Symmetry: C3
Subunit: 223 residues, 3 copies
């Protein structure tokens, strides 16, 4: 219990676990081949995040990185969490509009370099270089959101009216949640070191719970 | 040769290698698109396990973890082995019954958290927490075997009579092999520390050879 | 700037980055579902390699391995680069001939053991064992090139005349680029220690740029 941010990690663990339970219950009795696919995706994300937060809570997913003159605690498991869940979330958005195979490859490929290079920067000791990697990651993020705002919204307007507006909603939710992460990274202890780790951990917990449970609550209650 | 369990690692390496050779020979001349798919899966598993056991034999795949008052040797490569092969095995069982896409995603997703969290527990230093991760892993295992016993056996009874009984057999073999692993983990040096590492290594070698060669011998000699 | 081979790492970073930019520009306006698939693949490779070389340049992707009586610098990120790009390249060659699903699984599976076991050997401290892993890796390489020379060239002669000769070309380019890697490994500081790290790094940069940009230049300018 030596880490004062642990309460957020505890809240974070608990909400992911229950989030997993809700989707698990709701998905029972679904025989429609398509919905079964969406529920398969939409349940796996909080189950992974649960194990990650529990790792973070229990302390297994964090190491010490010397930069800025300090021994900075780095929740490397938070990055492992993102690497496993953001491509699942991307599939949930692409399958919606029935994207071609190639856009899915590039979108998930864009997504891996984003999260991989942030971790690179997150473990990077030379203070200046840390932000080189932050720039590369955020450029990747821009490719993702460009594809989902000007490539998918086109595909949405030719499909069903139920999937159109349903995508419009989740597209917008995606736009504003994803873009807050690099901001919080930049002002936190991994970047400029203004916001403290404790606050930073709180900020990442609320976003993760919103992105990993709330996103599915939207989708799984859609026609 | 400092490790007395090395003989099992050596036997283990040798049987995986020959297992790989048999399936490689048997698969020559197969032009049927489907069987080619099964043989692709059914050969890759022993080839990976070979490299892992050889790593374990040669010692590259093992580290020391302090718990229970000792510096416990941990064959982390055995866990790497499982993470690469159990989802291949799962595909071999799902493709059999022609499962929908979503059940395959959830089954392999269930399977990754199982093996990932066991490794987490296997490297976990705080003795009590080790079994927290064991509980999470085994819960995942139950989801897998639930899906394969009450979801696939239904899909098996509507397909071909050759694939029905052929799945019935491999379903049962899966049920009893997979469930022995968490038991052996629990009584071995990674858990309760009753069974010695040497015995433990023997137990994991016989199960791995059965699960990775024998399983394919069943499947690859089926209509 | 302590590493004299850094100039090659710098050249290497710069060419990957521009390579990424060219394919990105060229792929704009492509609405054909198939070409979009090829461009998705053909752009991701230099974007990954860019980040890897930049990691190598910036130094994040290299560690020290004691063997042969020295503390050998090991660019582990160069191996991470290959593990992410060679299966993409393999898809670019298989999708060309419209290979069945099973050959793709085995080819990419062959490809992972190749790169995984080389890294194993590359980090292996006991000098003799290093070449055990080199032998296992090269055997994998032979399986890949066997499949692409006697299995795909057959599939090429029954498809379109535009894809036939286009595959003939890229098949041959693949044959001679891939096979130079284990040679350079063998004569470099990771193996026999004749060629110096500086030269070795130069050799791997020219091959990587040829394999990761030039290969796509061929393919993306084909009918
Ligand atoms: C858990 C769910 C989601 C949507 C997680 C999203 C995370 C990101 C978009 C992370 C982005 C980063 C960028 C673009 C650059 C700074 C480092 C980050 C990895 C935080
Ligand atoms: C190599 C082939 C197979 C089928 C390997 C199976 C391994 C498992 C089912 C492992 C299970 C575990 C559980 C459920 C909990 C304790 C830790 C383990 C990873 C051993
Ligand atoms: C970046 C693009 C390509 C095509 C990279 C290819 C790398 C290889 C074929 C590596 C092969 C190895 C073998 C077969 C054995 C020695 C160790 C290596 C990993 C270099």
């Amino acid at each position: 219990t030596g880490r004062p941010e642990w309460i957020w990690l505890a809240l974070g663990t608990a909400l992911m676990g229950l989030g997993t339970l809700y989707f698990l219950v709701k998905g029972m009795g679904v025989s429609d081949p398509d919905a079964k696919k969406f529920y398969a995706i939409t349940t796996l994300v909080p189950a992974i995040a649960f194990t990650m937060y529990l790792s973070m809570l229990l302390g297994y997913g964090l190491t010490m990185v010397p930069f800025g003159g300090e021994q900075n605690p780095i929740y490397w498991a938070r990055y492992a969490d993102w690497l496993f869940t953001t491509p699942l979330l991307l599939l949930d958005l692409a399958l919606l509009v029935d994207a071609d195979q190639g856009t899915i490859l590039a979108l998930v490929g864009a997504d891996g370099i984003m999260i991989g290079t942030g971790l690179v920067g997150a473990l990077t000791k030379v203070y200046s270089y840390r932000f080189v990697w932050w720039a590369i990651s955020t450029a990747a993020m821009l490719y993702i959101l460009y594809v989902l705002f000007f490539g998918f919204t086109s595909k949405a307007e030719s499909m069903r009216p139920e999937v159109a507006s349903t995508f419009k909603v989740l597209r917008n939710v995606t736009v504003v949640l994803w873009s807050a992460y690099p901001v919080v990274w930049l002002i936190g202890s991994e970047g400029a070191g203004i916001v403290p780790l404790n606050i930073e951990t709180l900020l990442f917990m609320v976003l993760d719970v919103s992105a990993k449970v709330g996103f599915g609550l939207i989708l799984l209650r859609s026609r």
